[PDB]
Amino acid sequence: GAMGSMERASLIQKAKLAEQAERYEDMAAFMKGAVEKGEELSNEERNLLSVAYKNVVGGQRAAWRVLSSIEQKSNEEGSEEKGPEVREYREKVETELQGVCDTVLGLLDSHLIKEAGDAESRVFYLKMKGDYYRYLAEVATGDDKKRIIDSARSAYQEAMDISKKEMPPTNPIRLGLALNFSVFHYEIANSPEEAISLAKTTFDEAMADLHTLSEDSYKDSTLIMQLLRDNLTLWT
Amino acid sequence: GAMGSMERASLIQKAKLAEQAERYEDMAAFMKGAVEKGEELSNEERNLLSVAYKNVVGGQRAAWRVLSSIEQKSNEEGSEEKGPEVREYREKVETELQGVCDTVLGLLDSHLIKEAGDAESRVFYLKMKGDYYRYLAEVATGDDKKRIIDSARSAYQEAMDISKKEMPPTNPIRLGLALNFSVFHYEIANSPEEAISLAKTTFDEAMADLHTLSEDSYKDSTLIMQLLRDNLTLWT
Amino acid sequence: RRRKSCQA
Amino acid sequence: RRRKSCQA
Ligand SMILES: *Cc1cccc(C(=O)N(C)CCS*)c1
Ligand SMILES: *Cc1cccc(C(=O)N(C)CCS*)c1
Ligand SMILES: [Cl-]
Ligand SMILES: [Cl-]
Ligand SMILES: [Mg+2]
Ligand SMILES: [Mg+2]
Ligand SMILES: [Mg+2]
Ligand SMILES: [Mg+2]
Ligand SMILES: [Mg+2]
Ligand SMILES: [Mg+2]
Ligand SMILES: [Mg+2]
Numbered sequence A, B: 001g002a003m004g005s006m007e008r009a010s011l012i013q014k015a016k017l018a019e020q021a022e023r024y025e026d027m028a029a030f031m032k033g034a035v036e037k038g039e040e041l042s043n044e045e046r047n048l049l050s051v052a053y054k055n056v057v058g059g060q061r062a063a064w065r066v067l068s069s070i071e072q073k074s075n076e077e078g079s080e081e082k083g084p085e086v087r088e089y090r091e092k093v094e095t096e097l098q099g100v101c102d103t104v105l106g107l108l109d110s111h112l113i114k115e116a117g118d119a120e121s122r123v124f125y126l127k128m129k130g131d132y133y134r135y136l137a138e139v140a141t142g143d144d145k146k147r148i149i150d151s152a153r154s155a156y157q158e159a160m161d162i163s164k165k166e167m168p169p170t171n172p173i174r175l176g177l178a179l180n181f182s183v184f185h186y187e188i189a190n191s192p193e194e195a196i197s198l199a200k201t202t203f204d205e206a207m208a209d210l211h212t213l214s215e216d217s218y219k220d221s222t223l224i225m226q227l228l229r230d231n232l233t234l235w236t
Numbered sequence C, D: 001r002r003r004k005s006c007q008a
């Protein structure tokens, strides 16, 4: 599309500038253009892709939650009828959010996942697929909700299976995947015990493998382990 | 345009929802639609208009400054040539920023200012006109720079003349106008002594009139007086 | 205290 | 310490 005339390397350079400027919509557009060049992404480029879209969808999700809370209050007994505007505007934000999720899922399907053969890259993309189905599930209320939830579950499960076979328990991608799949269990799949079990097992297995790491890898792994602990403390 | 089919009251309601959701681009689009209905704005509606566009242009200005700093470093002796990308991306953000300024200035000219007869509304809009010319001046480097600067000066000066005749020295619009015109003098017009004199005189004349105010008006006025003091402390 | 998910 | 301007 609009980025078709720009060099791949220039798109990557501009994505990094957009990050520094906190222009995440631009960052995502640049990284979409880079993906659409058709070549595989490096580790750093995968990270830029994830940063860009997570920040974009993060603003939409936070806005959706604000609007959904207002809408729910409007439907309480005793609340004055204010017309269709709250629902309409929540729907507008929701549709935009769904569009961003569909865009990311489309990049993963055409054709990032199918060309990703190394465990790290494949797990990274499958985690992303689970995440964006999870964001679709956060807003889903209709007849496809169960299939959306199962699509998130299936992508996370494939990522977990690969990560357990091919990556050490301290690997940051493996750890972040487990963090997110545990959140999926807790708040999407109505399975808090599974969420807690996964977070605890992931934390304990990472703890046992820290002795193998350099100081820098130790810092990387313990940072994510603390996120698992934060959730365990909140949930127990 | 795109908001032509939505009721004026629904646009205002959605602008307030967008503010709560921190969706300032949406907020600005709603308020532009409301202005384009052709009716005058109330005090609260003027405030919503200003909030919306100030937040939008604020993100653009902050991004422009980040990119301009990187560009300036790239042109230092000893810096590696990295190609046209930094300039191109700074120009992209700059053009978008100029477009937002032109949009606001267009709403003021067609037809908010000409229908604003009460001192408060007229000063409010003329202050906005000075502000958006000032933001154009922040990025101007060419042959129209002097005329852009003079357009900001002229709008601020008319607002000052009306505010001195028609509004008390503690009025928050008058105070905020003086704050901004002082910044214009300091950092656009290369007149720091004028900036300091205006901030000091404005502060002292407001101080002397605080005794006339209710507790709530006193809180409003002293808040802006503190901004004037903050600048005086920075500049002296 | 919002639960944590993985922010790249 | 950035100088202040008027934020509605
Ligand atoms: C799964 C993943 C993707 C991108 C970055 C990371 C990571 O190392 N951190 C620190 C983000 C928080 S999990 C992980
Ligand atoms: C000039 C102006 C416009 C909108 C709001 C205000 C105001 O009262 N405050 C507190 C903003 C900071 S000057 C003033
Ligand atoms: Cl809407
Ligand atoms: Cl560009
Ligand atoms: Mg090429
Ligand atoms: Mg209504
Ligand atoms: Mg491959
Ligand atoms: Mg391995
Ligand atoms: Mg009507
Ligand atoms: Mg280059
Ligand atoms: Mg009138």
Ligand SMILES: [Mg+2]
Pocket: B119, B166, B167, B168
């Ligand atoms: Mg008066």
